[model samples]
Each structure stands twice: as C-alpha cells, then as structure tokens.
Target: GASKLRAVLEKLKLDITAAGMVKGVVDHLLLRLKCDSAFRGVGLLNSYYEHVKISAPNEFDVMFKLEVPRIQLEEYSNTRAYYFVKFKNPLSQFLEGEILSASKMLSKFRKIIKEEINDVIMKRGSPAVTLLISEISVDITLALESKSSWPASTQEGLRIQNWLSAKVRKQLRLKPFYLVPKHAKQEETWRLSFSHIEKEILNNHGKSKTCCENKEEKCCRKDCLKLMKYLLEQLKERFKDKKHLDKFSSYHVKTAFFHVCTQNPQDSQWDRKDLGLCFDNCVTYFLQCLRTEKLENYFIPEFNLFSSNLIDKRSKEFLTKQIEYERNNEFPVFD
Candidate 1:
C-alpha cells in the first residue's frame, strides 16, 4: 500500500509539472493576444492556483478579467448570484458600443479567439469562450470587476470571518466583485466570481497566519482535501454506468471540506502527524453532508451544492454505503 501510494503521489507530481509547462505556453499565447488584440487590459486568473485539482491537471480555467470602468449592475431576480451589467455612458471609450451586452461581447471575443487558436470549440451556453491551444483545453472567461460591495446574500457566507479575523475580512471585502459573461435565457447575465478570494483563503488558511510557513508545523488540510477528491473520482469510476451519480462533482466535496475546517478551527486538529485521523474526520463530515442532503455553497449560502434533483434517494443511499465501506476498509480506492 505504501508503494501504491508512492506511485500515485509521483504520478500527481509529474502531472502538475507537465500542466505548469502547458500553462507557460498558453501564457505566451495570451500575451500575444493582449498585445495585438483588444484585450490589452485583460488579466489571467483562476486555474489550479487554488489547488485541490486531480485527474485532469492539464485542464485550465483562465478568466480574462477585463479592466473596464465602473459599471452599474442589476441583480437577477431572487438571487444576487447573477447580474446584468449596464454602463452609465452607453458609448464608453473602452467598450466598442454605448450599450454593453454579454452576447455581443462574447460573439466578438469568440471570433478573435477562433481566428487565433486552432481546433477551437465554441461551447454553447457556457460562460467562457472555449478553445484549444497547444493541445490544452482553455476556458477563457471574459469578466469585469465592479466597485460595489458583495451581495447581501453572500455576507453570511465565507465563515472565514470567524476563523481569519476582522482585518482579513475587511481586506477581502475591499476587493472588487467580479462578473463574467454567462447569458441565461434572454437576459445578459453576469455570474459572480470570488475565485481570487477563495484562493487567498485556502493559501492563508491558518489560525496563526504562519501556521504552515517555514519551520512551522504543517497541517493535513490540503492533504485531506486531495484524498477526498481522489476517493470521489474512484467511486465515480466504479459506478460509471449510473447516470444519477453524474450530479456529484468535486465542488460539492470541496465545499464540505471547507465547512469541516471552519467547524474544527484549531490547528492542532489538522496536525501533519495525525493525517490519517484528520482525513477520516473529513470523510466522516462529508458523509454527514451527503446523508442530510444539504451541502451549502461556501461562497453562496443560498446555493445548495447537493440540491441537484438528478441525484435520487437511491443514489444517495448507495453513495453513503460505499463511502462508509471505503472508510472502514483503509480506502481501497487509492490502491
């Protein structure tokens, strides 16, 4: 089992190294695009920077965050998660038109990307412009940051305020709210993104702020997260034919892990020496979320990660049993 674990660890390391190389090539391409195209102020964001990615390490999610002037945002009905952007000056100097719409922006953006990159696939209904560059699939999401505060719905979320403290919380709030072009129905919607904040939270996830730094005791938080993700993928492969299980995603597992960390805030609880115990605790918490049929989105409390109607009661029951079996059997899935 140690040899098997070592092999798996090596494979993950090699994949990460290879993925970094691909990112370098993609970065050059993006640089060229920015220099020669209308994306001068656009910046790259949100890939494996937050870590916790497994299996498809080569897969990259890049957000081309546009540095546009202050824009007015109208919230989508009921949920503040989505928005429709409206510029005060319709004929803005930055944007082509006086009125900026997601459809129009995406159309021009898609055309530019298609012309530049080969084997590009324009994924329909997706927020980002999908294209293939250097044998790597990249999702280039066009986004703009608004100066306004975060939505009221999200205020109660990101329980990090209790764990990280008021200073960090204030700094996070000062950052601009990002909106991406994700059109749903006929509305020109802008989906909110806190990818930057999430990355920071995970990287600096220590009670003392220097808990995992040089010479400091390392915690098993990230290790446990990787294990949880690995377990989920293994189970998915075992029950591949079951369509209902398709609804279960890594995001659900990640969210559960975040909640668990907040619940057990002490650094001692995640000591490196107690990795096995910590991982088991994380799996137990995940099982609790699965059994209760409620996994709240870390950023958006209103969004239920486990609210997918696709996952029936039978599938949930089966998952619960399988997870329990793996927990007790020394996680044979890793082997």
Candidate 2:
C-alpha cells in the first residue's frame, strides 16, 4: 500500500509541476514577497455518496447530499479547505483587476488552472467536486446521526459551502459555486440537518430538484470555470511576449479557457482524457509547502522555469510531458 501510495504521490508531484508552471506566473503576482507571510495551509474533500437520505418508506424521502471536497487550511481533522498568503496593499485594486480585467492573460490563466485541477481530483478520486447522493434512506435521522454531526447537518454544510465560495474567490479568483453551473439551482439548496449543529430542510420530498433551473444550463461547472479563468489569465500575463500574445486570438483563448473551465472538477475522464495539470494543484501544494518549508517546495521554481523555457523555446518537447506524473497521467506535484 505504501509503495502504491508513493507512486500516487509521485504522480501528484508531476501534476503539481505542470500546473505550477502556468499558475506559478500568476501566483508570483499574487504573492507579496515584501509583506506576505509564509502561509500554513491544508486542503480536504471529505465526502459521502448518500450524505443525506430522506425516506418515509413510501413516496421516497428526498435526501440532499451536498459535498465540498476542497476545503483547505486545517489538518489532523477532516475538512474541505486550504490557505495561502497575500499582501494587504491595493487589495481592492488587485481584486478588481482580477475580476474586471478583459486581458487575454486572465482568460488563459483561467483555462490552465481549471484544466489542471481537474487532472488531479478527477483522475485520482471521484467527480462532482463532492459526490452527493440524493437517495432515500430507511431512517433519515439515523442516517444523519451516524456521521459525527447528526440531526441533518444541511445548515452548517450550506454555511461552510457559502464560506468556501467566498474564500475561493478571495484566494483563487474563484467564485462561490464556481463548480456549480449558472442554472444549477441544486448547488444552492442546503441539504440535511446539522448532526454537527442543528438545522433541517423541510419536506425533503415533494420539492423541485432546484429553484433556479431557469438560468442558462451551463455545461461547464463553476469550480472548473474559476480555475480555468484564473490560470489562463496568469499564463497570458506571464508569457506576454509581443509575438506569442499576438499570435493567438483573444476570442480563441477565451473560448479555450471556457472549454477547460467548465469541465467537472472531479471528473474521472481526467485520468483517461486530459493532458497536463493546470493551476489549482500547483497553487494549493505550493501554498502548503511554502508554509511548511518542505523540500518539495524547491520544485516550484524549477518547474516554473522549465515550463517557461518550454513555452519560450516553443520546444518540440512539451515540458508538461517532462514534468512529473500521477496515477492518472499527470504530475505528482504540490507546492
């Protein structure tokens, strides 16, 4: 198991390498070497298929299973989180630029980030960010209680999800429900009562699947979109040489960014489908190692430089291939 696990780690490291290359450039902008602190961070994605089950024996009870797997910043504890550092200066301007900039770099950065994160989680684990099961259980309360937090934990879950949305936006230029589609009304619905606290969604059954089904049903999920948009922007900015930048149409870059950004964050297809890691894995790992000062952190600059050269030289050999690889054909990388 350890050997296999080590192999997995190696693969993840490579994923980190490729992702770091693209996202690293943008991260350079984000990190404030002058005033930013070395961040201590952790990321987690604890989930269950049937997280919330509702059942009355007949007329199946509707259980809401909402999952958030990428929470960072805590360890030795089950959480979906991560953390990093940034300066407090020009905070609004920086955020505004990231959000409002129509720069092709931003668009490219977003694509790179989304594509890479999908490479790791989807290839390595399951999909749907946090695979939720909306099924009926024999004893709904019993099911909820079985977990550490009992009594229908939907309320706390929602709060956590909401908080996570805000945090993702702040750190990664991601939005709340970035993984969620614009028409994904289900993403907003709070599922279950708090076994951890105390909350509930009334009439688990007989309710529409989601309220905002009217929005344009976006094929690409929001989480992927956030990463994709952010990373693409970074790349466009980092490699913004006159010729290279001008070679591609802004529309093509934006469309490509959208293509990668909307993919499932945890899609199994990544293992067998995609090539190269994007941004999230690199950012997450890089942030973590920076705080911990791990030996692996050294790979950050090395990979970034390598990727830069590859992109610069327009090398026949794509550095993304030379980077490292995970079980699912990606780099086994972290911060």
Candidate 3:
C-alpha cells in the first residue's frame, strides 16, 4: 500500500515553480520588514523555513525583534511560557521615547506596514499582527530579545535533548530567547518563543551528524511529520463548523510528532524503507493523546497542550473516532 500512498503523496507535494514564487514573496517581506527602522531585527520563523510544511506552503510566520537594554519579566501562574514584559530602560531612545507597550507597538507596526503594502488587513488577537497578503496569510509576531539563560521551568522539557545529546542542548541554551507580544483580555503579555532553537533541532534530527547523508541510513522522520500535518488539515476541513474542535491547531500535531521522534530516537526506528510503519506508529501516538486528552508541549512539559479548557472532551472524542477509522482503513483522506 506504500506504493499506492506514494503515488497519492506525489500529487500533493508543492510544485517547484510555486515554491519558488512563495520563497520570493517571503524574502521580499523579510527584506521590507528588516529595512524599516522599527523592525530592523525582524526574522522568519516556523513552517516553510522548518521544511515540515506541506500543501500550499504559502502561509508564513515572522518574528519582529525589538532590542531592549533589559526587561523585567513577570511570570504568569499555571504557565511556563506566558509572561509580562516590562522594559527596565524606559529612558532609552531605542523606541524613540515611546513606552514599551505591546498594544501600542503592535498598533504602530500594523499602521506602518499596511501603509507600505496595499491590500493588507489587520486581524484581532492571535498574539501577532496578521497580514493577508494576496490570499496568503502571514503572522508578524513582536518579540523582545533576552540574552539571559532560559527559565528553569523549561529545563525538564525539550525531550530532544535525550536524543540529540545534551551538548547540543547546552549550545542552544546559550542562544537568545524571545518574548512575543500576546493579547489577553485587554492586558499586555508575552509568550516565550524558541523557534530558532526548534528549527535547528528539527533540521538536524538524526542522532549521528551525517544520518541523512548515508544512503542506507536516511530515515523517514520528516516524511511522517508531513503526512500527519496533511491528516490534521483534512480533519479540520471536515469539522470546520464544529466549534468544539476549533482549539486543535496544527501545532498540536507538530508537538505530538516531536514527542514521537523523541520516543523513537534511533535511525532504524524510522527507516525510510518502513515509512508506512513509521507513519502509522506516529499516528497511533497522536491518537492516543487525543483519546487521553493530554498532550504535553515538547519544549515545556508544564504546558498541557490538550488542556480541557483548550480542547473540550467532545472534540477529543471526535478526533479519536476519526483517527481510529483512518487507521483501520487506508487513510482515505490522502486519497
């Protein structure tokens, strides 16, 4: 059935010509943002750059980094990632005498960016300034740079350390962590983003440095992730009207995929020859998370990705049923 599956997958892969066009657009946006004085440190994050995306590959997420002398962070209870950012150096002219306010900053960026680009509209919430660019959606998240060590709450997580070795983890920790502007009930807050570190781990996922180069050793880890993302997309479309399932985003599947990779670390566990088996096993793990209604964030175990408030019981049951049917059948969604 892999022969049949491969034939179907080939049709869904992004066209080479289309990919180049998307790349051109994204590069243009990055250049524009970086050239602007207010967003000189803007950078790309997630999806297309990570190489885990499928389908249109038109959507992208970018982070606009603001340089600050220092920030006083107030941690939100019951969460390891959410924080309130307060600039200690309020007198600095870095922000042109403007106070550090997430809402104000986001509003200003939205106004300036929209004026520069025609046919762009600003959306609500979403922890970022969303721009609709020519039928393609781009999220520009505002972040503040912090060179200090990562919080201790995130120490126990990052399961990739067990597979990729602690040496790499230490090096990643040496890098900067970002706090992105997030909206919450008229209150200003920031969400921690380790997107740069995540991209490094995902790209070099193999245990050995040259795991992907060895012809006989290349694994299907990335292939499995793409299939899972495709399955999740179809499920969302099928249940588009169901409000209960609205909380389940593709991030849930991506987190589950990362967890699955950590559990099965060896190259042979995800051998290219056993792509179907590996994909099936990955799906099985994700289905189990749905059934149990508990999926931990790979980088922050303190964050229960499938929290009851985030994902209702009805949605979890619905996903379980769909996944079971697909596993029993031959994943008709792909066909």
Candidate 4:
C-alpha cells in the first residue's frame, strides 16, 4: 500500500531543470507572440496545471487578457450569465456599431497564432487555441479584461463567509473579472470569468496564514484537490477514448472541491492526517452533484456547468456510475 501510494506523488514530480526548460519553451513562444502586440498571453490554466503532471504528456493553459475600457454588457443568452460585450467606444478594427464579437476576436487571434507558431488542434466551444509542442500541450486563451464593478449576477456566489471571510470576498470583488469567448446556444457570447479571483482565493485558501506554510502546520486542501483531480484523470484513462466520459473535466472536480471546502469550513474538517477521509467526503459530494446534474460554476452560481446539452443524460449516468464504482472499490482506477 505504501509503495503504490508514493508512486502517485513521486511520478508527479519533475526535475527543476525539466520544469525550467518547459517554461523556457513557453516563454519564448509568448515572446514571439508578443511581436504581434495584440496577443498578450497569461496565467489561469498555467498556474493550476503547472504541477501534478502525474499522468502522461504535460499540458499548460495560458490565457491572455485583453484590456477593455468603458464597456457595458448586454445579457445575450436566455440561460443567463452569457453577455455581448459592448464597448462604449471603439475597441477593435472589426466593428458593427460597438459590440465586440467573440467570433471575430477569436478568428483574428487564431490567424495570428497560426502566423506566429503554426497551429494544431482547436475546438469551437473553448476560447483557448491549443498547440502541441513536443509532448507538452499549451492552450492559449483570449479574454477581454474588465476592471469595473462586479456583475449583478454574481452576488449569489463566492459564499465564503465561514472560510475565507467576508473581507476576503470584499477584497476579491476589488479584483477584475474577465469575459472569455465561449460557445453559447450557437452569438458565440462571451462568458464572464474570474480567473484572477480564482487564482487569488486558491492562494489564500487556508484558515490561518500558516495553513500552507512549510515550517508550520498545513492542511490537506491542496493534497485532497490533487488527489481528486488525479482520480478523475485516472478514470478517463481507465476507459480511454470514450468521448462521452470526456464531458467531465478537472474543473468539475475542482468546482466540487471548492463547494466541499466551503460547506465544511473548519480547519479541523480538513486535517492533514485525515486526507483519505477528507477526499472521500469531497468525492462523494461530487458524485452527489453529478447525480443531480446540478454542478454550477463555482464563481457563477447561475451557470450550470452540468448543463443539459453540455453533458447529456446518458453521459451523466455514465460518469456517475464510473465514479461510484471507483469510490466504492477504494479507487482501483488509481492503480
């Protein structure tokens, strides 16, 4: 048991040299892309996926934030949350009155990316354009940055009064939100993103300042999250090429992880020694969410991440059964 357990964490590690060279390659790629001026690349996915390359080829996601000044949002989707970003004044060359089109912006970004790095695979749904560099997969995202007030739709979320504190909420609200290109019911409306806030909250997730400190006591929040993310990946591999299984993502696990943490806010709930038990609590919560098909985006409570069309009824049942089997069998998928 001990022998197999360490394999998960040990294999996840790479030599500092290996890590450096990967970022070095990414650095030069961004450096080259900056020559285009419009393609300002960035952090969200990069930070989240940097470590925990326990599986196969390493992957990284870089989101470039495009600054938007003096803008208003028109709610474009009946589903709520998706918006047409209308610039009060002119922002880009492609224009119809004032609204910035996600389609046009993404198309232009795609052309520039192809011009800069030569392209690989991409999809219509996500804003990120991916490139396969050697074994590493780097995803580049184009987002419009807004530093204005928080949207009216988000007041229901970031329910951290018991954990990160109401002050933390206030501080995060001061941070900027992003409008990322998304595939909606077919405007290509921009979905609001708080990736920056996500980055911040993750950093400050502990109850006390010493929560993740190296010299002091630490909690298992990160370890539990990694375990859950790893478990999901292992399941995907267990039943490879099942496109329906691809419907679930690490973000789904991550979202449920946050929900679990918020629901069980005390530091005692996530004791470092109780990692396995904590992960069980977290995983089952996710399974519960999946069964209901009601996993909402962590930041945008209104946005159902487990939407009807995004993951069909059969797909949801398939994922739920897979996770249930794994959970009950003590995660043989990990093996």
TM-score winner: 4
Q: What is the RMSD of candidate 1?
A: 3.8
Model-by-model lDDT, in order?
0.70, 0.24, 0.71, 0.71
Off by over 4 Å in 3: 14-40, 43-53, 89-100, 119-124, 184-186
The TM-score values for the models, in the order shown, are 0.82, 0.17, 0.86, 0.87
Ranking by TM-score: 4, 3, 1, 2
**Model 3 pairs whose backbones collide:** none
lDDT for 78 in candidate 4 is: 62
Clashing pairs in 1: 90-98, 91-98
Across 9-104, the per-residue lDDT of candidate 1 in tens digits comes to 556556446556556645655665576445676666545322334766656666667655667666777555777677754224334344456776
After superposing candidate 1 on the true structure, give the runs of residues whose Cα lies further than 4 Å from its correct spot.
Answer: 1-11, 14-25, 28-40, 46-52, 89-100, 119-127, 133-135, 183-187, 214-216, 308-315
Preferred candidate (lDDT higher): 1 or 2: 1
Model 4 regions more than 4 Å off: 1-7, 14-57, 118-127, 214-216
Per-residue lDDT over 107-134 for candidate 4, one digit per residue giving the tens place of the 0 to 100 score: 7767766665653344333536776655
Which regions of candidate 2 fall more than 4 Å away from where they truly are?
A: 1-220, 257-335
For candidate 3, lDDT tens digit of each residue in 1-335? Answer: 77755665687763334445445555666677677666676665444432334664656565656665566676777477777665664313234233356666676666666655552455653345665555565666667778887877688878666688888878888888887776542346667777777667768999888988879879888788878888888877777887656677778888898899889988889888898899889988998898887898877888888888767788899888888898788888776
- What is the lDDT, from 0 to 100, of the residue 27 in candidate 2? 37
Model 2 over residues 112-215: C-alpha lDDT tens digits?
A: 33454443211110021221123211111111011122211122222222222334323322112211111111111111222222111111100223322434
Error of 1 at 165 (Å): 1.6
